[PDB]
Structure formats: C-alpha cells, structure tokens
Amino acid sequence: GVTVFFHAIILHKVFIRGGEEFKWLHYTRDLGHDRVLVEGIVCISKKHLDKYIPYKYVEFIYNRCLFIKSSLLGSGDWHQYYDIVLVKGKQIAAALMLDSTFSILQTWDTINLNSFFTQFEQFCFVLQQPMEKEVKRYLWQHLKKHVVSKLKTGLIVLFVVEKIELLLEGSLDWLCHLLTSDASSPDEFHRDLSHILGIPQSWRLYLVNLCQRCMDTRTYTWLGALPVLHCCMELAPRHKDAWRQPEDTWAALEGLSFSPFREQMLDTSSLLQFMREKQHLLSIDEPLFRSWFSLLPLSHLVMYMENFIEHLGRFPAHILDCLSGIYYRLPGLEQVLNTQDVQDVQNVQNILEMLLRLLDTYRDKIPEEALSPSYLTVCLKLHEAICSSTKLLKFYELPALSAEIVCRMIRLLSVQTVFQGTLAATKRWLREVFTKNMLTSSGASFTYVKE
C-alpha cells in the first residue's frame, strides 16, 4: 500500500472518509492562537496511484480532491496539507509548512535532503493549483525568522523562493551573504557545496535569476555568491583561441547581462571595498577575478589590478586574463581615445603601464600552462586600437606602451606576423600623425617639437 498523511486546521472526534478506494484520527499539537492542527494517516492501495480520491471531514466548504501523483512520490508516502475545516489560515499553514519541511534539515545528508525536496515538491504542487502578496510577505517573514552550514541553507532558501516565486523584496543582502562562503580554501567550499548541488535540480537557473536581480536592482553583494554559481555552471576549459570566447563565457557569467550593470553602476568604490573584504574568494574560485574584471567599468580597472596585486602574485595566470578583459573593453577604450579628454586617456595610459608592471614584475612567474599565444594576438588587437584611435602626436606614449607589451609577450615566448602587424600599425600612426615635413622652410626649427 501507498500511504497518505492528511493534515487539517480548525471534545470532538474528527474522521477521514470519502470514496471507497481505501463506506461512511489523532490530536497532533494544539497550536493555540485559536486553532489546532489535526492530522491523520491512511494507507490506500498501490493501484490507486495518481487517481482522484475526493475526501471529506466529519466539512464546510466555501468536495475536496486528492492526487497522489507518481511524479512526486518518493519513498512511497504522500503528504496532503493546507486542508482547512481563509487568508489567515493560508498564512498560518504556510508558517507550519515551512517549519515542518525545515525540521528535516537537522541532519544534513542526501537522505533528509531528498526527503525535504520531495515533501516540498508534493505540497507545492498541491498548493499552486488548489482544486497573494500577503502570503509571500508572511512567508518571507517566517523564513528570515527561522533562518536568522550556511551555504547549504542559502541554496535551500534559494530553491524554495524560486519554487514559491518569492522575489527577494529589498533584502537580497541576507541571502547573498548566506551564499557567500567564508571558506578561505577551495576544497572546503566544494565540500560544503557538493552534498547539496549533487542533487538533480535547477541550481544554475535559480542562481542566475538571483544574480540578474541584485544587478537590475543595483546592488553588489551578489558578487560574493558568484563562486557558487560557477560550481553550478560547469564551465568548459579554455581553447587555443580563448580570446574568441564571448565576454559572458570567458568571465563565467553566462546567462547574465552585466554590461548594462557595469556601465550603469554609479558607485564603484563600494564595489571595490566589498571585493577587498572578500578577496579570499579569488583563491577558491579562479574565474571570479575575471568575472569581477568584467563587472568593473574602464574607469576603475587600475584599482582592481592594484588592490589585488598580491593575488596575481599568488596566481600569475590571472595576469593574462587582464589583457583579455581589456580586449573585451576595446570599444569603450576607443570611445575614450577618439575623444581628447586628458583624464580618460591618462587612465588608459595608467592601465597599460599597470599591465607592463605586471608583465615585467611577474615575467619570471607566469605558468607555461596558461601562457597561450592567443594573448599575443590579443595584445596586437590592443595595439591597433591604440594606434587607430590615438590621432594626436602628444599621445605617443600609448602606442609605445602597446608595443612594449607586445615586446614583453614575445620575450615570454605567429610571432613574426604579430610583429609585422605591430610595426605596420606604428608606421600607420606615424604617417597619419606626421603629415607635414620635419623641418621648416629654413631648416632652423623642427615642425613637430616632439618628433
């Protein structure tokens, strides 16, 4: 037989009766609050599964209907809830459902986890189609109260809110802090995440819908949660032309539109402060750095390479990523160089000087397993842009720095073609810059003082 556990809300004796599929109970705990929760167990045949089995309580209806659906039955027991014998009862029963379904998470293990998942799926199937802002608000209340081993509960809360379509109304902070792993080690992170992510479920989609929020609502705590998403993403390895990968893949932000948030986030100082607080994350998840490099505007990229110079010293294979990131910003760079604003051009010069610092300082430290010649090409791209947008002569330092980057990359190691392209771009820049002769008609003075 397959068993069903009916619950109900309201001396007298209650009885369970209906169709003869089983013609014509016990006290659980009298909550108080002017109500009692009365339950009952009954085991029906094993062939009556997924069949309508209307029932009754002797009940006042403002016939009930059961569906023991074979798609949600686990060990073989079903749990029917929310039976009342309205909105007030709905809220009370939501509270009790939350408490009951979380009373199984005591011994975090695959067994109790799957039991919780099965009970939740069953009851929510019964709930969403029984045949509501207040309900969502009160459920958020009880959830926050019951919850405030942190990563598992964060993922569980995320799964729940996505199942109950409970948007995080103004407090993404708390859930993103829960999903933020204080673990300073990668193995510990994977250990905390595995027992809960190994379950077949839509973790990636939930995390992506959580990350899109906190970006469309203009916040930053979600960054600390990016690592988890990455474990759920199962990203692919880099190839011979990693530069050809889109910015969303290379940055490990698939399914997220970050360019709008990147360009519309008006306070990047707090972003960098949050980052520096959670710098340990960079060690447990490699791509995180990249992701961050992708979520920062071109005006606050040097600070990101400076504050986290130590990490790059521990992880020099990230230096190259910087270049890649800058490549994915080429338009903006050009948008800045095609103009003559000294501040932004100077920021770009600073960026390139920082990249040269990284190369030289950490020239004797990069791991040959991450030093692909693709970056050479990437560098060349950069050069071309710096030589195509930089029209004035008082900005030779940027073509010079680009050529120096190419030189250091070649020294780190096709090559001839990249050198040809670099020389060609330099000659083109000199041509489009030196349009008049070097010396005056008399020859006494030069035309361009800086030639």
Residue numbers in the entry: 378 to 387, 397 to 408, 412 to 413, 420 to 453, 463 to 466, 477 to 499, 522 to 567, 583 to 599, ...
Quote the passages of the study that discuss this structure, keeping the authors' original sentences.
Unusual for E3 ubiquitin ligases, RNF213 possesses two unrelated ligase domains, an RZ finger and a RING domain. Unique amongst E3 ligases, RNF213 also encodes a dynein-like arrangement of six AAA+ ATPase domains, two of which contain Walker A and B motifs and are catalytically active. Recently, the E3 ligase RNF213 has emerged as a restriction factor for phylogenetically diverse pathogens.
Accounting for the flexibility between the individual domains of RNF213, the murine and human structures can be flexibly superimposed with mean Cα deviation of less than 2.1 Å, indicating an overall conserved protein fold. By solving the cryo-EM structure of human RNF213, we discovered a carbohydrate-binding CBM20 domain in its previously unresolved N-terminus. Due to the flexibility of the CBM20 domain relative to the stalk, the CBM20 domain in human RNF213 is resolved at a local resolution of ~4.5 Å. A large cluster of 23 positively selected residues covers the CBM20 domain and the exterior face of the adjacent stalk region. The RZ finger is connected to the E3 module via linker peptides that provide the domain with significant flexibility, thus explaining its apparent absence from the previously published murine RNF213 model and its relatively poor resolution in the human RNF213 structure. Aided by the model, the cryo-EM structure of RNF213 reveals that the RZ domain is comprised of a short alpha helix and two beta-sheets, each comprising two anti-parallel beta-strands. The resulting beta sandwich structure is stabilized through a bound metal ion, presumably Zn2+, which is coordinated by four evolutionarily conserved Cys and His residues (C4505, H4509, C4525, C4528).
